[PDB]
Design a protein around this ligand. Structure first.
Ligand SMILES: Nc1ncnc2c1ncn2[C@@H]1O[C@H](COP(=O)(O)CP(=O)(O)OP(=O)(O)O)[C@@H](O)[C@H]1O
Ligand SMILES: Nc1nc2c(c(=O)[nH]1)N=C(CO)CN2
Ligand SMILES: [Cl-]
Ligand SMILES: [Mg+2]
Ligand SMILES: [Mg+2]
Length: 158
């Protein structure tokens, strides 16, 4: 199944974090990277007392169960020093969010797929569109069309 993973970093040298993350994503068992986006510098969503993010997206082919992929993504966050601050939407050395897991709809305590907020975020949608311009969401919506509708500002390269 192709999983689409959003990468965000705004602490501790985001370019280094993102490169380290991509290496580690490629090392997850029973999986391999298909396509990587460009790297974009994006203003924070949420609290404004934090640095700009590097955002990217990756398409990962995997035979893992979605929760076992999440175990592996969370382990890479840990490996890279991610600390979950008290405040919502605060800074991170690395944030790996599962945007899509093929065409699956997943709603569990640990895991909500498609990512609950992705359709509201150009920092997630633009890098996804770069790597999967023909994507169709589980609900039948085209990514290309969501982008049109929302008219989100285009992103700046890192
Ligand atoms: N699609 C998904 N990808 C990643 N984590 C998910 C997820 N759906 C649910 N989660 C859950 O989200 C929990 C909190 O993860 P955090 O990374 O702290 C959220 P965040 O990425 O800072 O905010 P965001 O989800 O609004 O982008 C995880 O422990 C995990 O169980
Ligand atoms: N620009 C930008 N802002 C954010 C981002 C992100 O990846 N990029 N992630 C968040 C929560 O994970 C909150 N805010
Ligand atoms: Cl959907
Ligand atoms: Mg996130
Ligand atoms: Mg996250």
């Amino acid at each position: 199944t192709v999983a689409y993973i959003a990468i965000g970093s705004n602490l501790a040298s985001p370019l280094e974090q993102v490169n380290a993350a991509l290496k580690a994503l490629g090392d997850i068992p029973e999986s391999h990277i298909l396509t990587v986006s460009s790297f974009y510098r994006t203003p924070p969503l949420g609290p404004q007392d934090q640095p700009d993010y590097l955002n990217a997206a990756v398409a990962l082919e995997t035979s893992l169960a979605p929760e076992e992929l999440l175990n592996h993504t969370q382990r890479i966050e840990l490996q890279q020093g991610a600390v979950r601050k008290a405040e919502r939407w605060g800074p991170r050395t690395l944030d790996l969010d599962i945007m899509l897991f093929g065409n699956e709809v997943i709603n569990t305590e640990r895991l909500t797929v498609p990512h609950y907020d992705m359709k509201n975020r150009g920092f997630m949608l633009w890098p996804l569109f770069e790597i999967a311009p023909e994507l169709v969401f589980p609900d039948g919506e085209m990514l290309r069309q969501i982008l049109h509708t929302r008219a989100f500002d285009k992103l700046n390269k890192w």
